[PDB]
């Protein structure tokens, strides 16, 4: 019983991780794509506070 429950759990502790990876990477992209448009604005705020 334990024998058919250990392999069960193994295949679920693979399924769970597999989905986490897909969100993680898509939400990694969502932090890239959000920045690269509001990118010149950051450089502006930085520049403006180094040169005084």
């Amino acid at each position: 019983l334990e024998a058919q429950y250990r392999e069960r759990e193994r295949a679920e502790t693979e399924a769970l991780l597999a989905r986490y990876r897909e969100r993680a990477e898509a939400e990694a992209k969502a932090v890239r794509e959000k920045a690269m448009a509001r990118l010149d604005e950051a450089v502006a705020l930085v520049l403006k506070e180094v040169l005084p």
Partner: protein, 62 residues
């Protein structure tokens, strides 16, 4: 007669014995069923523990 006394003496012991020995063959059959039962109850408890722990581990990792 003295012999009509004696046959009632065997038939008396040889029913007490056979009721005692079906009160051991009942008792054992009970205690063993309640044993067998509890050894799969304990099996139930183990499986939960090991699955609740495991899911948390794989969540924290992800």
């Amino acid at each position: 007669k003295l012999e009509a006394i004696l046959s009632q003496e065997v038939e008396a012991e040889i029913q007490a014995l056979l009721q005692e020995a079906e009160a051991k063959a009942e008792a054992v059959k009970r205690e063993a069923e309640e044993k067998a039962k509890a050894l799969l109850q304990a099996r139930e408890r183990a499986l939960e523990a090991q699955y609740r722990a495991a899911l948390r581990r794989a969540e924290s990792a992800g």
